Structures are given as structure tokens and as C-alpha cells.
Amino acid sequence: AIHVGHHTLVFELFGMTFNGDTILATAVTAVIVIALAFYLRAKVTSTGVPSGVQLFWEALTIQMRQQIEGSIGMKIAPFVLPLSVTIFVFILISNWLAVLPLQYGGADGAAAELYKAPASDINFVLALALFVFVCYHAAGIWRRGIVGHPIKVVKGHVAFLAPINIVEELAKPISLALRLFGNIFAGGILVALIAMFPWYIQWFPNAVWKTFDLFVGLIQAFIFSLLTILYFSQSMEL
Amino acid sequence: LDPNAIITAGALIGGGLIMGGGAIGAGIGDGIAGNALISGIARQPEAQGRLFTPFFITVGLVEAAYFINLAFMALFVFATPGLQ
Amino acid sequence: LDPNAIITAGALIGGGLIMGGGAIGAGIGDGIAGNALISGIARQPEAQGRLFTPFFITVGLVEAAYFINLAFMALFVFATPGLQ
Amino acid sequence: LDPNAIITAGALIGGGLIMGGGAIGAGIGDGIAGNALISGIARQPEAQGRLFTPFFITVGLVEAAYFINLAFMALFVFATPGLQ
């Protein structure tokens, strides 16, 4: 009784299945992010002491802009800044929302969580990774032409390794997705595993693992955004 | 005998192999990255903040493998491909 | 031939693999991190308090994996998925 | 006994071995590369910007093998060659 996967609120539409729980978690994360954005919009000031939300947002912007400037000049690739900031905040909020105590007994002795981190669903990570993939490949095409960019990526650094280079490209999105998936998917299992204990024993491993999971979510958001920025930099260098 | 029995035994062995390999890789890689971090901090103490950005990047690239392996291990033992 | 016997033997082998990999990873990673710590304390003793911060981080990233493996091993041998 | 069941158990064990080896290699190689990167950044802070150019090149190769293994693992478990 571990019930791995088994999405809830699953509904069909236009002949396509949809995981209601994943959509709901993503929508809650987006609502939190948009609320933070519009709360900054109402309290963004340069002539006074900044608020906490302004400090958080500008720290994120400073970090992402520093990474971009280090890798690819902000003149060439300005959009990468909002892209990376959005990716980071989205992943971080979605991962950290799992820390809340929303696990219970699903009337059958198996743990059920009202909110599950959307990154534990392959659809979420695939959407993010493929959006990034298309984004920086389009950027590279614009930078180096329709035919120039594919030739450059195939040739890589030494032409004699042309096969591996191709694989590397295919590994860029997959590595971005699976990594995140795993780092969050494992969490969804461990908590479930820890739910097999009695409460008086379940409380302690649950606390330890969920603290470590807070750390893991922070690191995963950081890595995903940084690798996105650096893939843009690689794809946009002449 | 029951085909699912041997299929599940093979799935459990394969998942064990996946998890063991992932654990070996992640443990050793994290140890090596942490060794680099500790040595760098010992040499020039004021680089502590400066070295954390690459270190975690390394931790991101190393642990990935393990966690990716972990995911597939679940697929082996919870939704076994080829199960009859 | 009881299918549960085959499933349990496979689960025990998988758990043994998980624990072997976790032990290898934990031992070698902790050894490397401790090598860095010992070398740092030998070089610049005053930074001892400074060095224990990254070290405890490194160990934290290593033991974690080990214990994660442990959890899954407990799943394999006590709550064998796919058991009939 | 079902021939397909034996073939599937063998395929699962083979895929587990593939992924274990790939994860060990990826984790340890990425850890070594990250150790080099962290040391280089510690000694030469201004080199970070350039130090990502070779480091990720290495990560390009170390990762490649891994994912290639991963690919074949799928072929083993999802499209088992020789399956009757």
C-alpha cells in the first residue's frame, strides 16, 4: 500500500487526459507567484526603504542578472533574465508548498496528500524542460542562422565527436527534466513511506525529511534556473 | 510457477542495482565536491561565500544521477515494465 | 514452488544491493570529506570553526543518500512491493 | 514456465546493471569535474567565467555516456530485444 503515481481528480477533455491534482498544484503556485508579483507592483519604491517582498524579488533579479552577465552579455540576451527568474520562483514555490501538513489517511491505511508538489508529475517537468529547449534553440537559430546553428551544435568542439555532440543536445532537455522530477518524485515516496509508522514515531522522520526536502527544493530551483541560463549562453555564442 | 513471481524478483534485483549504483555515485561525487569546497575554504577563508555557488552546482549535477536512478527504480518496483 | 518465496528472495537480494551501494557511497564520501577537513585543520588551525560548516554540509549531503537507501531497503524487505 | 517471463526478468536485471553503472560513472565523474572547478574558482576568482567553458564540456561527455546507457535501458525494459 504505497500508491505510487495514481493521480487524483483525473478528467478527460478533447480526448486528452488531465491530472486534476497536478493542475491544481500548478495553479496554486501560479496564484502565489502572481500575488507576490502584484504585491511588489503596489509597493515597488526606489526613494524609500524596500519591503521584504521587494528585497526578495530584487535579490533574485540580481543573482540571475549576475549569472547572465557572467555567461552571456545582458545586451545580447535580456529575456533570459525574466525567463530564469520565473523558472526559479515557480519551481521554488511549488516545491516548498509541500512542507505544509496536508498528508492524511486515505480511508484505506495508505497516505494521501491534498497537495503534491507538481514537479513529482512528469508533465510539469517536461513542460518546463521542453519550453526551455525550444527557447534556447530558437535563440541559437536567431543568433547563428537557420543552417548555421545546427552545423555549429553538430560540430561542437571537435568534429570527430559529432555523434556525442548530438547526444549532448538531446541530453540537455532530458537531464533538465528527469533530474528535477527525481529530486521531487523521491520526496513524494519518502513521506509516503514515513506514513507507515505510527504517529508517535512518524513525526520525527517526517520532520527530518521535510526539512531536507525544503533544502532540496531550493537547490533544485537554483540548479534548474542556472542551467537554463547557461544553456542559453552556450546556444548564443558565435 | 507464477510468471509474475520471477518478473517481480527480477524487477526487485534491478531496482536494487539501480539504487546501489546511484548511491555509490552520489556519495562519492558529493564527497569529492565537498573536499574541494573544504580545501578551498581552508586555503583562503574569505572565499566561503564565493565557493558556495559552484559547489551547489556540482551537488546539482552529481545527485541528479542518483535521484534520476531513484525515479527509475520506482518504475521497476511499482510499475514494472513487462509485468504479466 | 511458492511465488512469494521467489519474490522475497529477490527483495532480499535487492535490499542487499541497496545497502552495499549506500555503504560504499557513504563510507567513501565521508572519508574524502574528512580528509579535506583534516588537511584544512592541519594547514590553518584557526579556521576549524570555519571548516566544520562546509564539512557538516558535505556529510549532510552524503548521509542523506545513505539513509534514503536505507528507507527503500526497509521497503524492500518489510513491505516488498509486488508481493503476492 | 513462460519464456517471456524469463526474458523479461533478464532484461530488467540488465537494465538495472546498465543504470547502476551509468549512475556510478556520472556521479563520480561529475564530482571530479566539480572538484576541479571549485578549486580553480577558489584559487582564481576571476577565472569562474572562463572555468565554466571547459567544466561543462567535461559534463557534456560524462553526462552523454549516462544518458546513452539510460536510452538502452529503455530499449531493454520497454522494447526488450529477443522477446518472444
Next chain:
Amino acid sequence: LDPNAIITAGALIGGGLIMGGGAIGAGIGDGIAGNALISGIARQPEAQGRLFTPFFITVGLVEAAYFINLAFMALFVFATPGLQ
């Protein structure tokens, strides 16, 4: 065949794997920590006394992983889970 026979063979194989991994990890980690200690003492005599404290920590973290495996191996071969 006796189900207990299969389960006991699997348990023995799993315990052997547990000991193999634990021994590899413990030996290599202790060797690495001791290499750090020996180098530190060779560089500086008076450092010896202050080097033993981190060393005992490292050996404490390495051997722990070993002596956990030990316990579970004893669990595998003396009170085998799932032994029907």
C-alpha cells in the same frame, strides 16, 4: 522446493552484498582519512594532538555506516524478514 530454502539463499546473498559494500566503504574511507592524518602529522609534529579530533569524527562517520550495515546483515541472516 522448500520456500525457506529459497528465502534463506536470498537472505545470505543479500547479507554478503551488505558486508561487501560495507567493507569496501569502511576500508577506503578509513584509508583516506588516515592518509590525511599521516600527511598532516608529517607536515607538522605539534599538529598531531589537534588532528586526532577531526580524524575521530571522520572515522566515526565512516565506521558508523559500516556498523549499521553489520546490524542489518545480522537481521538478514538470523531473523530473515518474510521467512515463511
Next chain:
Amino acid sequence: LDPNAIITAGALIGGGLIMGGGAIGAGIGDGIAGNALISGIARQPEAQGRLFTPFFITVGLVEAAYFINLAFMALFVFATPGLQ
């Protein structure tokens, strides 16, 4: 019990071992070579170009074996020797 099934299971396990060993070798060797390359570029920024000639040679030696293994793994899996 079809003998072809036993032969195919053995071939799949053997190919898995081939690919796992090749992945370990490729990942660790490429990681070590990349560590050398990154350190060399850190010490001598202008040396970057000069360091690609030997580094890739190492990669060529490290990857070639892997790919040779890959070829043989295909032979094990797609055209199994001794299959009857």
C-alpha cells in the same frame, strides 16, 4: 522451457554488464581528464587551446573503449552468439 529464452536472458544480463562497465569507465575517465583540463586552464588561461589536443586524445581513448563495448553489447543483444 525454451532454451532460446535462457540464452536471451543471459545475453541481456551480459550486455547490461558490458554497458554498465563501459559507462563507469567512460564517466570516470572523462571526469578525470576534464579535471586535468579545468585545472590547466585555471593555471594558464592562454593554454586553453594547447590543452585541447591532449585532452581530446584522452577522451578519444576513454570513449573509444566505451563505444567498442557498445558495439559488442549490440552483438550480445541483437545477434546473440550461440543462440539456438
Next chain:
Amino acid sequence: LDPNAIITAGALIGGGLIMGGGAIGAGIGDGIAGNALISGIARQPEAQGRLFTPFFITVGLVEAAYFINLAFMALFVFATPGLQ
């Protein structure tokens, strides 16, 4: 088929794994400790007598683990747990 035969085969494989892991750990740990000792004596000849103290503390640990494994190997192969 005699259950004792299967149990003995499992015990022999487990003892083989125990000894393999113990030998790997002992050999590599001894090599690392001896590398430290040789380098230390090379830099500071007079340190020889001094360095033998920590060195024996290292090897003493390493061999211990190996020899511990040895003991259990006997238990596996001479007084097999669960044997009937």
C-alpha cells in the same frame, strides 16, 4: 532437491561477496595509507619513526574491517544461518 544444497550455494556466494568487498577495501585503504606514509617519509626522512604511529592507526582500522568480514565469511560458509 535438497534444501541444504540451495542454502549452501547461497552461503558460498555470500561469503564470496564478503571476501571480495573486504579485499577491495583492505587493498585500497592500505594503498592510500602507504601512499601517505611514503610521501611523508620522502619529504621528511626523520619523520619515519614518528609517522608509524598514525599509520598503524589507519591500517589497524582498515584491516580490522577486512578481518571482521573474514570472521563472518566463516560463519556464512561453516555455520550457515538458517541451514536445516
Next chain:
Amino acid sequence: LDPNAIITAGALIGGGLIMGGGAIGAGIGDGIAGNALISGIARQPEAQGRLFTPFFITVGLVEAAYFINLAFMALFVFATPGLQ
């Protein structure tokens, strides 16, 4: 159960083991030797010409161990000893 089937399965597993070990050794040894070569060239460009002399020896002592393994795999897989 044709005796040839079991013998061929065992031979395939043995050949896979031989390749796994040979590839691990070849990849890691070539990576280490290439790290040495890259470092040596980085410290001084002009030594390149001389450095390739010992390097070719090292690779020769590594690749040989690999290729010998390859030869024996043929014996295991194409002309299985004791095929009966």
C-alpha cells in the same frame, strides 16, 4: 533445459563480466594517464614531445589489459570452452 542453453547463458554472462571489468579498467586508467599528460603539458608546453614517450607506455600497459580481455570474451562467447 538443453545443457547447451545453460552453458551459453553462463558464457554470455561471463563475457559481459569480462567486458565490464576491462572497460572499467581501460577507461579509468586512460583517464588517469591523460590527466597526467594534460597536467604535464600545462606546466610546461615544450615537454609535450618527451611526455608522449611514457604516456604511450602507460596506455600500452592499460589498453593491452583491455584487449586481452576482449580476446578472451571471444573464447567465452564464440567458442565456449566445455560447451558440451
Next chain:
Amino acid sequence: LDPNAIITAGALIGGGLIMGGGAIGAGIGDGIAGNALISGIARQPEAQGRLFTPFFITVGLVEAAYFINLAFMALFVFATPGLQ
């Protein structure tokens, strides 16, 4: 099915595991010790003889374990414990 056949197969697999572990440990430990010896002789040629004393100790340790493994291999394959 002769139980002695299963016992002999298990003993052969266990002996192969013992030999593989011993060979890996011996080779890597001897390589590390020889690396230390070569580096020391390069640094201080006048200390060459002085370095041979510790070198023969480390090797004496490493090989010891290896040869011990040989003994038990014989005990496994020529005096297989548990034979019916």
C-alpha cells in the same frame, strides 16, 4: 538434479568473486603505493633506498590480503565446504 552440482556452481561463483575482489584491491593499492614511490624518488633521489622500506610494508600489506583471498578461493573450489 545433483545437489553437489548446485554447491559446486555456487562455490565457483564465490571463488570468482573472491578473486575479482582480491585482484581489484591488489592492483589499485599497488598502483597507489607505486605512485607514491615514484613521486618520492623523483622529488628526492637520494632517498630512494629510504623509501623502499615503507613501500615494501604497504605492498606487503596489500599483497597479503590478496594472497589470503587466494587461499580461500582454494578452500572454496578444492575443499568446497558444505558438500553433500
Next chain:
Amino acid sequence: LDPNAIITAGALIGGGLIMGGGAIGAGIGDGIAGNALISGIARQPEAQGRLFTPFFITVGLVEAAYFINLAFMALFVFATPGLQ
């Protein structure tokens, strides 16, 4: 089934393990010794002649074990002990 079939399969698996371990040990030890030799020659050209004598000794220890393994593998595969 034929006992000889099972015994031969076990012997082939054991010999494959023997050669895999031997190749891993030989490759990695030769790589480490060659790294020492290459670094020594890079640092001091005059040492080129002097460093061969230790290097060979290291190789002599690294290869010997491997070849011992090789011999025993033949014993496993051509004169399988316990065959009947």
C-alpha cells in the same frame, strides 16, 4: 538436467568475474603508476632514466596479480574443479 551444464555455467561466470576484477585492477593500477611516471618526467627531465626502475616494479606488482588471476581463470574454464 545435466550436472556438468550447471557446473560449467558456474565456472564460466566465476572466470568472467576473475578476469573482470583482474582487468579493473591492472588498468587502474597501471594508470596510477603511469600518472606518477608522467608527472615525474614532466617536472624533472633528468629523472627520465631513474624513474623507470620504480615504475617497472610497480607494474610488476600490478601485472603479476592480474596474470595470476588469468591463470586461475583458465583453471576455472579449462580444468573446472569439481566437474562431474
Next chain:
Amino acid sequence: MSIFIGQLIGFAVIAFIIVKWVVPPVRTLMRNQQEAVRAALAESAEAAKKLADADAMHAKA
């Protein structure tokens, strides 16, 4: 219910840890950044005042 109770106690432990050892340093960092911004604004204002006084002195002399 038992699962809910156990995970709720675990979350209480997490919250206690956060408030005891994570909230203080983070709030200190935020306060330091706010005070730095306020100090920068104060320096800007007093520099404008300094320039005004310098212009006044130039007019006098």
C-alpha cells in the same frame, strides 16, 4: 487520522526549527539590507545639502 497527527507533529517540529534558527538570521539580513538602503538615501540627501552649502559659499566668496 494517525497519519495526519504524526505529520502535523512533524510540521510543528519543522516550524519550531525554522522560527528558532532560520527566521532570526534571515530577518537580520533583511534588516541589514533595509538599513543599508536607508543609509544610502541619507548619504544622497546630505550630499545634496553639501552641494547646496558649497554653492552658497561660492556665492558668498
Next chain:
Amino acid sequence: SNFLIPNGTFFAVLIIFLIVLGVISKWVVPPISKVLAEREAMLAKTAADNRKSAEQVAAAQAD
């Protein structure tokens, strides 16, 4: 069931992400960049004003 199989959810989540991106593109990053640039310009202006006051006070007695 195989949880690695993408589902229609892939699209829905994507859309949500895009929406967030839009907001972050037009109500978080532009204002924050403007604020940071204003702060940098303010620091530069403060330094320039201090320098101007110093040189002016020197010139007062010099002239």
C-alpha cells in the same frame, strides 16, 4: 501505471507557466531593473556631489 508517460496535463501546466512568465516579464523584472538602475545612478550622483562639494570648497579659498 507508467508515470513517465506524458499526459494532456503537459499542455495545461505549460499554459499556466506562460501566464506567470508574462506577469514576471511585465510587472516584476522591468520595475526591479528600473529600481536597481535608479539606485546605482543615485550612488554615482552621491559620489559626484561629494567630489563637487570638495572641489568647490577648495576653489572658494583658491579663488
